[PDB]
């Protein structure tokens, strides 16, 4: 086409979606990880995760307001990944990298799994 | 912080949100413009437009499944702007620039209004 493009548009959209999440505006699901609860937007979860994409395209699960993750999933690993989904920023540290990689493999977040594998190989 | 960042993350999120829109997955509102109907995600509309942001943060309007725009709004101008919201790409042409600018002013999309003003000043 003959379109023009606004370079910062996608980043600005994601920043506003994170602002809505922080104020709990139009969040439509709670993700339960052990005792911890995380409110989010189903569309953002689907856009970032192969697992959530499969869950919310399912004719029955698409209507659930609560999703319980596998008990092996670490709440901190999930929190770091949920923050990444809404910001593009990953808080990857020596103390959390194993929990982050395991959670990203479960959530099917291919790019996160790739950077975790590379950071582990380097050490 | 000590975060790492995935450059293409915001663009990839927006691409997936557009894929959901095209398949009509988890759309929660219909925007009525004259006779024309446009299905969308409230969160994406809010993230892109000062007008939708005001509408869906309103305790009563946040629950509406149908929003009717002012009858002066041109459906083609709206369609071009809705496509921009989900792609960062604006189909700005000599034949639509006046309708696009008027719709962007009404929707409160400051960056679109700015490029329309500059393109008009050049001609």
């Amino acid at each position: 086409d003959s379109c023009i493009q606004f370079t910062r548009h996608a980043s600005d959209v994601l920043l506003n979606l994170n602002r809505l999440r922080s104020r709990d505006i139009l969040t439509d699901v709670v993700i339960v990880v052990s005792r911890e609860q995380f409110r989010a937007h189903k569309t953002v979860l689907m856009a970032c995760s192969g697992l959530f994409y499969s869950i919310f395209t399912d004719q029955l699960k698409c209507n659930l307001s609560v999703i319980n993750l596998d008990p092996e999933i670490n709440p901190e690993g999930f929190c770091i990944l949920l923050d990444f989904m809404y910001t593009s920023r990953l808080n990857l540290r020596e103390g959390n990298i194993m929990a982050v990689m395991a959670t990203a493999m479960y959530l099917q977040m291919e790019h996160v799994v790739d950077t975790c594998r590379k950071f582990i190989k380097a050490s | 912080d000590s975060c790492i960042q995935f450059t293409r993350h915001a663009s990839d999120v927006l691409l997936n949100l557009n894929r959901l829109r095209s398949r009509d997955i988890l759309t929660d509102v219909v925007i009525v413009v004259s006779r024309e109907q446009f299905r969308a995600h409230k969160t994406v509309l809010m993230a892109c437009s000062g007008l939708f942001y005001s509408i869906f943060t309103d305790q009563l309007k946040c629950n509406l499944s149908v929003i009717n725009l002012d009858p002066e709004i041109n459906p083609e101008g709206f369609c071009i702007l809705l496509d921009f919201m989900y792609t960062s790409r604006l189909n700005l042409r000599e034949g639509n620039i006046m309708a696009v600018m008027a719709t962007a002013m009404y929707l409160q999309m400051e960056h679109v209004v700015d490029t329309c003003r500059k393109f008009i000043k050049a001609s």
């Binding site: 023009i4 493009q5 606004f6 | 790409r89 604006l90 490029t115």
Partner: peptide, 4 residues
């Protein structure tokens, strides 16, 4: 704004 750019030419994509």
């Amino acid at each position: 704004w750019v030419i994509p």
